[PDB]
Amino acid sequence: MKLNISFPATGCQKLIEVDDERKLRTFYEKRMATEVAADALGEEWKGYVV
Amino acid sequence: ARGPKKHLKRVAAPKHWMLDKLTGVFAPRPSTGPHKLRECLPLIIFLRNRLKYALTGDEVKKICMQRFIKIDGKVRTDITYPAGFMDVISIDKTGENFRLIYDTKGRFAVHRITPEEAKYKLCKVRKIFVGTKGIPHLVTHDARTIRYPDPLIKVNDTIQIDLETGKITDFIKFDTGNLCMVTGGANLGRIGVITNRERHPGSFDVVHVKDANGNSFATRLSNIFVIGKGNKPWISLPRGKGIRLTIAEERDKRLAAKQSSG
Amino acid sequence: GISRDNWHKRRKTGGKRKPYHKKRKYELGRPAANTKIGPRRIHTVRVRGGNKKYRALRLDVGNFSWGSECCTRKTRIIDVVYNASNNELVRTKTLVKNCIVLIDSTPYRQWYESHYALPLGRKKGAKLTPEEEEILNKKRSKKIQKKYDERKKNAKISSLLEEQFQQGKLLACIASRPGQCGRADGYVLEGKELEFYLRKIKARK
Amino acid sequence: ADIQTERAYQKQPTIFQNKKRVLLGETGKEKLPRYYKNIGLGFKTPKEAIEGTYIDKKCPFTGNVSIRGRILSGVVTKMKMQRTIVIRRDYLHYIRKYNRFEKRHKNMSVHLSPCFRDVQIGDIVTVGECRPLSKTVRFNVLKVTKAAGTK
RNA sequence: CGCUACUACCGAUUGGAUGGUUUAGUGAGGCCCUCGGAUCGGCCCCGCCGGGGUCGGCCCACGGCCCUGGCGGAGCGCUGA
RNA sequence: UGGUGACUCUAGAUAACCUCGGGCCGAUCGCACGCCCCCCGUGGCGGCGACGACCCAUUCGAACGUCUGCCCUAUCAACUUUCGAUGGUAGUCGCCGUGCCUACCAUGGUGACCACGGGUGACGGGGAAUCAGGGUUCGAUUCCGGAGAGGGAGCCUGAGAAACGGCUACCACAUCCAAGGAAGGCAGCAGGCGCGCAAAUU
RNA sequence: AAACUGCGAAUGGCUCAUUAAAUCAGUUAUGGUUCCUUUGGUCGCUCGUACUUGGAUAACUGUGGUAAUUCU
Ligand SMILES: [Mg+2]
Ligand SMILES: [Mg+2]
Ligand SMILES: [Mg+2]
Ligand SMILES: [Mg+2]
Ligand SMILES: [Mg+2]
Ligand SMILES: [Mg+2]
Ligand SMILES: [Mg+2]
Ligand SMILES: [Mg+2]
Ligand SMILES: [Mg+2]
Ligand SMILES: [Mg+2]
Ligand SMILES: [Mg+2]
Ligand SMILES: [Mg+2]
Ligand SMILES: [Mg+2]
Ligand SMILES: [Mg+2]
Ligand SMILES: [Mg+2]
Ligand SMILES: [Mg+2]
Ligand SMILES: [Mg+2]
Ligand SMILES: [Mg+2]
Ligand SMILES: [Mg+2]
Ligand SMILES: [Mg+2]
Ligand SMILES: [Mg+2]
Ligand SMILES: [Mg+2]
Ligand SMILES: [Mg+2]
Ligand SMILES: [Mg+2]
Ligand SMILES: [Mg+2]
Ligand SMILES: [Mg+2]
Ligand SMILES: [Mg+2]
Ligand SMILES: [Mg+2]
Ligand SMILES: [Mg+2]
Ligand SMILES: [Mg+2]
Ligand SMILES: [Mg+2]
Ligand SMILES: [Mg+2]
Ligand SMILES: [Mg+2]
């Protein structure tokens, strides 16, 4: 499972490869355009919304 | 077919263009315009085959894109433009004027005219109808629509149009004793005086014409174009005055010309 | 799809013919526009040549003309009562050409009372509202009263139309095709035709 | 009464019969003005069409049709359909090889207006061409002339 | 009548075969109608940043009335697709 | 008012309507640039074209109709009408006229002058071979019409297509695949297989 | 250059399977229809921010998925 994350204010894209079920649990059973809290990705993403 | 056709086979072209068979497979299909496809002369045919100014179709385009040719006083760059009966062609570069008039053989002839004569043309009234607000409208043989015509002008009459302004100067009524030319059928290209008109309700009318030499013939009403009032035409006539000769007297004239040559 | 050609039909002698070409675009047909009564709903159809056909699916108003009085007014459509072609159309309340419908009478009554200045459609109880009283009993000068009195000479309506006005609904016939132009226009029934359709409606029940 | 035999009201579309009038003019006569036209080509309108009360939208004189095309002739053979009859046209076809002819016939279904009555089997009829009125009908009866045995 | 060969006919019977029809029962897909509403906007309610006028206590401070550019949150409020 | 052999034609008048899936009534581009005013401006005016557009007329057509005309076959003599066959009335649909379709009605329509059915090594003509005068046979084939794109069917766009060097399915074949999928139509020019007595350069 | 927009791609070329009043030929009709384009005519004929109004999308710059396509 890869994640292509885009920051529009800076307009920067980054592809991150994640091998962890816990990090992907919060994104399961979600439809498009929904807002999620990306805290499970790690300690860097505290307060980020995706 | 599923729509309009865009080509014309050379052998299927009108025979008054006098095209040869071995030059190519196709012939210039006339563009849509004032005159019918079977009753017009394309600009390229007149420009390279009649006048010998150009040798190929490319040179006709090179001439036309210099805006040298004018038809009825307006510059046309289309090389397949349909030019028809009683049209005026002007070339200011060489100072030449021509009028498309049928000869006694039923072919358009290279007929040079005075630049003073090139300022007007004759048209045949095809339709008269009253439009919105009670305004009369007159439609000619070359798709010209004129508003507020003279109340005395009816169908099958002739009107003189000034090419610069496109307005009627005078007119000739369709009556016996006037001068007419045949524009279609077996008697195409003949000039004469109307003798009588036969009316057939629900069908075509038949009109009898007699030429200067006394030869009589008949045509349909749609094939007659009134040229002048009485015996005086309002336009210049080609080399032949509209009298059709028989084969025997054409041979006699040719032999007499050969004997006097040399 | 739906084809309205002629080569699928038997010959005059009765023998069948083998077709020589398949279905063509210009021979097509389209499903019928069953126009009902309700809030307006119209769909446009792109037809041959790039033109439009207005396919009315629901209509509730239309302009009808009182021919004898030459009074054309826009009135709502209430119900469908008779249909010459088929009685199933009446049951489903389908608006087609030449169908007999019921329309409101109020605008015609207003025009009649404003023109002739006579009561119409009023009960015998003579109950009134001041607006109607000043419409009918307004103070006019000698010249205007002279014209109104002269108009009162020709103010006379048949008993059938008067009874319909008392009922509040008039019988009308639709002359336009709702499925083709998108509007339901017609004329108010009167005269021998009104008697004919009244007899037909009564006999149907 | 006799005219009104269909589920729909039979009316002449171009005549307005609901024009109101004073009570004095109503007592006189309830005579609807008749609509008729001259079809041209020298054919005269039968008096029964002008004075009649029938309703026929396909009648050449009181209906909405136009006569243009060919004018043909035939002999009446069958009168069993409603307002339309079947006539027979006889001719000879030439065979080049034998320099002779053979007898041939055609059948035409034509529309007969109510203005023409007392039409019997075996009399001559002159018909004119119009727009297709039905699947097989393209001609309308213009004139009727009786047989040689008329007394 | 007894020899020698060929073609064409019948006719125990059922095979390898295809092709053409139709009775009934299903029936892809497009099109039309009646629903449906993932989602995307615009208008109102607040809040703080910014520019034009004016009004008020007025002296380079701060509110009122409108507009105006952005940003954040509500209302199953309204509306359009 | 004007016109036709013939209008329910064109034009005129009156009362209204005028579709949100909405008719028009210019928020477009180029080249030369100049005359005028109590003026220096919100400056006013102006020449040729290009593009676009509601509606008439014209041109190129297309589509439905009228009359006459086609090869053998009776070991094909009655056919059509339940599921439209013939006609009437009112509607629907269609770009329009019409059983084109629907509802209610009448019993009609065709046929030894050959209907109906069957066969055709049948696309139709302009034409070709042979021929004293008659006639017999051929016409797939460069021109004019028709039909088709492996067989059917249904559509989008567009002025115009039931289009196939467009799409969507079924039927028959058939290509790549990492087995999850993706992509097909030479009766266009060459060329290849097969078929055959029988026909050319990738 | 690329891309958006406009037009054409319904012409041409090939073949003769179907098709026997069907196709087709001559002769008439559309007063019973539609018509890109060309040509001509109308285009202050309506009495009710304008010194020019609004939001997006490619090409481009960057991040990617599939064994595979003129996929996105
Ligand atoms: Mg072609
Ligand atoms: Mg051309
Ligand atoms: Mg076919
Ligand atoms: Mg002979
Ligand atoms: Mg379905
Ligand atoms: Mg009028
Ligand atoms: Mg009808
Ligand atoms: Mg009928
Ligand atoms: Mg043959
Ligand atoms: Mg064949
Ligand atoms: Mg011979
Ligand atoms: Mg011989
Ligand atoms: Mg041939
Ligand atoms: Mg042939
Ligand atoms: Mg063959
Ligand atoms: Mg095709
Ligand atoms: Mg093919
Ligand atoms: Mg093949
Ligand atoms: Mg296929
Ligand atoms: Mg187009
Ligand atoms: Mg196809
Ligand atoms: Mg191909
Ligand atoms: Mg093709
Ligand atoms: Mg090949
Ligand atoms: Mg290939
Ligand atoms: Mg050979
Ligand atoms: Mg070989
Ligand atoms: Mg493009
Ligand atoms: Mg196109
Ligand atoms: Mg070739
Ligand atoms: Mg023909
Ligand atoms: Mg039509
Ligand atoms: Mg046009």
Type of residue found at B104? T
Contacts of B202 in chain D (CB under 8 A): 40-41, 68
Q: DSSP string of C131-149? A: HHHHHHS----HHHHHHHH
Please state, in angstroms and rounded to a whole number, the distance separating the CA atoms of residues B190 and B217. 10
Please state, in angstroms and rounded to a whole number, the distance separating the CA atoms of residues B179 and B199. 20
- Give per-residue burial for B215-243: e unless 16+ CB within 10 Å, then b: eebebebebbbbbbbeeebbbeebeeebe
Please state, in angstroms and rounded to a whole number, the distance separating the CA atoms of residues D112 and D74. 13
Residue B69's CB is within 10 A of a number of other CB atoms, namely 23
Q: Is C106 helix (H, G, I), strand (E, B) or coil?
A: helix
Spatial CA neighbour of B18 closest among B111, B110, B108, B78: B108
Please state, in angstroms and rounded to a whole number, the distance separating the CA atoms of residues B112 and B96. 7
Greatest Cα-to-Cα distance within chain D, rounded to the nearest angstrom: 80
Residues belonging to chain B with any Cβ–Cβ distance to chain D shorter than 8 Å:
201-202
Backbone angles phi, psi at B45, to 5 degrees: -65, -45
Q: How far is the CA of C1 from the centre of ligand 22 (A)?
A: 27
- Give per-residue burial for A10-47: e unless 16+ CB within 10 Å, then b: eeeeeeeeeeeeebeeeeeeeeeeeeeebeebeeeeee
C58, β-bridge pairs: C36, C41
B170, β-bridge pairs: B160
Task: Answer whether B touches D (≥3 Cβ pairs < 8 Å).
Answer: yes
B146, β-bridge pairs: B138
Name, in order, each residue with C-beta under 8 angstroms of B221's C-beta and a sequence gap of 6 or more. B156, B197, B204, B205, B206, B207
Cα→Cα distances B103→B64, D13, D52, Å: 26, 56, 61
Contacts of D7 in chain C (CB under 8 A): 84-85, 200
Assign residue C121 a region: left if phi > 0, alpha if psi is -120 to 50, beta otherwise?
left
Please state, in angstroms and rounded to a whole number, the distance separating the CA atoms of residues B181 and B111. 16
Please state, in angstroms and rounded to a whole number, the distance separating the CA atoms of residues B43 and B26. 16
Residue C111's CB is within 10 A of a number of other CB atoms, namely 16
Place of tokens 């009168």: D79
Please state, in angstroms and rounded to a whole number, the distance separating the CA atoms of residues B45 and B60. 9
B162 within 8 A of B169, measured Cβ to Cβ: yes
B21 within 8 A of B11, measured Cβ to Cβ: yes
Domains of chain C, residue spans: 1-30, 31-105+169-205, 106-168
Query: How many residues are given for chain C?
Result: 205
Name, in order, each residue with C-beta under 8 angstroms of A48's C-beta and a sequence gap of 6 or more. A37, A38, A39
Spatial CA neighbour of C62 closest among C196, C173, C189, C192: C173
Please state, in angstroms and rounded to a whole number, the distance separating the CA atoms of residues B167 and B151. 15
Backbone angles phi, psi at D127, to 5 degrees: -120, 155
Give, as one character, the DSSP assignment of residue C153: T
**In Å, what resolution does this model reach?**
2.8
Please state, in angstroms and rounded to a whole number, the distance separating the CA atoms of residues C85 and C126. 43
Cα→Cα distances B242→B4, B61, B233, C27, Å: 38, 34, 12, 52
H-type helices in D4-145, by residue range?
23-28, 47-51
Please state, in angstroms and rounded to a whole number, the distance separating the CA atoms of residues B60 and B245. 35
B141, β-bridge pairs: none
Q: Which nucleotide is nearest to A17 (CA to C1')?
A: G64
Place of tokens 């000698």: C142
**CB pairs < 8 Å spanning C and D:** 29
Please state, in angstroms and rounded to a whole number, the distance separating the CA atoms of residues D134 and C162. 43
Please state, in angstroms and rounded to a whole number, the distance separating the CA atoms of residues B27 and B15. 12
B218, β-bridge pairs: B208
Please state, in angstroms and rounded to a whole number, the distance separating the CA atoms of residues B81 and B168. 25
Task: Answer whether A touches C (≥3 Cβ pairs < 8 Å).
Answer: no
Type of residue found at B135? I
Give, as one character, the DSSP assignment of residue C26: G
Is the CB of C2 within 7 Å of strand F? yes
Q: Is D99 helix (H, G, I), strand (E, B) or coil?
A: coil
Q: After which residues is chain C broken (C to N over 2.5 A)?
A: none
Q: DSSP string of chain B? A: --S-----BGGGS-GGG---SSS-SB--PPPSSSS-GGG-EEHHIIIIIIS---SSHHHHHHHHTTT-EEETTEE---TT-EE-TT-EEEETTTTEEEE-EE-TTSSEE--B--TTGGGEEEEEEEEEEE-TTS-EEEEETTS-EEES--TT--TT-EEEEETTTTEEEEEE---TTSEEEE-SSTTTT-EEEEEEEE--TTS--EEEEE-TTS-EEEEEGGGEEEEEETTEESS---SS-SPPPPHHHHHHHHHHHHHT--
Place of tokens 């005078």: B170
Distance in angstroms, CA of C48 to C1' of F7? 27
Please state, in angstroms and rounded to a whole number, the distance separating the CA atoms of residues B163 and B119. 6
B227 within 8 A of B233, measured Cβ to Cβ: yes
Q: After which residues is chain D broken (C to N over 2.5 A)?
A: none
Please state, in angstroms and rounded to a whole number, the distance separating the CA atoms of residues C60 and C58. 7
Type of residue found at C183? R
Cα→Cα distances C84→B121, C80, C200, D3, Å: 62, 12, 10, 16
Q: How far is the CA of B32 from the centre of ligand 20 (A)?
A: 17
C41, β-bridge pairs: C58
Q: Is C102 helix (H, G, I), strand (E, B) or coil?
A: strand
Residue D10's CB is within 10 A of a number of other CB atoms, namely 14
Give, as one character, the DSSP assignment of residue C125: T
Please state, in angstroms and rounded to a whole number, the distance separating the CA atoms of residues C82 and C128. 35
Spatial CA neighbour of C169 closest among C40, C91, C71, C75: C75
B124 within 8 A of B180, measured Cβ to Cβ: no
Distance in angstroms, CA of B132 to C1' of F54? 15
D111, β-bridge pairs: D84, D140
The technique is cryo-EM
Contacts of D16 in chain C (CB under 8 A): 67
B46 within 8 A of B109, measured Cβ to Cβ: no
Cα→Cα distances D49→C169, D14, D139, Å: 39, 16, 18
B14 within 8 A of B29, measured Cβ to Cβ: no
Sheet hosting strand C36-37, strand order edge to edge? C36-37, C52-59, C41-46
D108, β-bridge pairs: D87
Assign 3-class secondary structure to B56-92: CHHHHHHHHCCCCEEECCEECCCCCCEECCCCEEEEC
- Tell me the two tokens of residue B156: 């099958």
D64, β-bridge pairs: none
Nearest residue on chain D to C189, judged by CA atoms? D18
Backbone angles phi, psi at C147, to 5 degrees: -70, -40
Please state, in angstroms and rounded to a whole number, the distance separating the CA atoms of residues D66 and D86. 21
Spatial CA neighbour of B120 closest among B159, B178, B66: B159
Name, in order, each residue with C-beta under 8 angstroms of B75's C-beta and a sequence gap of 6 or more. B67, B69
Give, as one character, the DSSP assignment of residue D47: H
Question: Mind telling me how many Å the CA of C68 is from chain D's nearest CA?
Answer: 5
Q: DSSP string of D59-95? A: -TTTSS----S-EEEEEEEEEEETTEEEEEEEEEEEE
Domains of chain B, residue spans: 1-116, 121-171, 174-244
Name, in order, each residue with C-beta under 8 angstroms of B259's C-beta and a sequence gap of 6 or more. none
B154 within 8 A of B125, measured Cβ to Cβ: yes
Please state, in angstroms and rounded to a whole number, the distance separating the CA atoms of residues B192 and D50. 49
Give the CA count within 13 Å in the CB-facing half-sphere of D68.
5
Integer-rounded Cα Rg, in Å, for chain C is: 24
Please state, in angstroms and rounded to a whole number, the distance separating the CA atoms of residues C144 and C152. 12
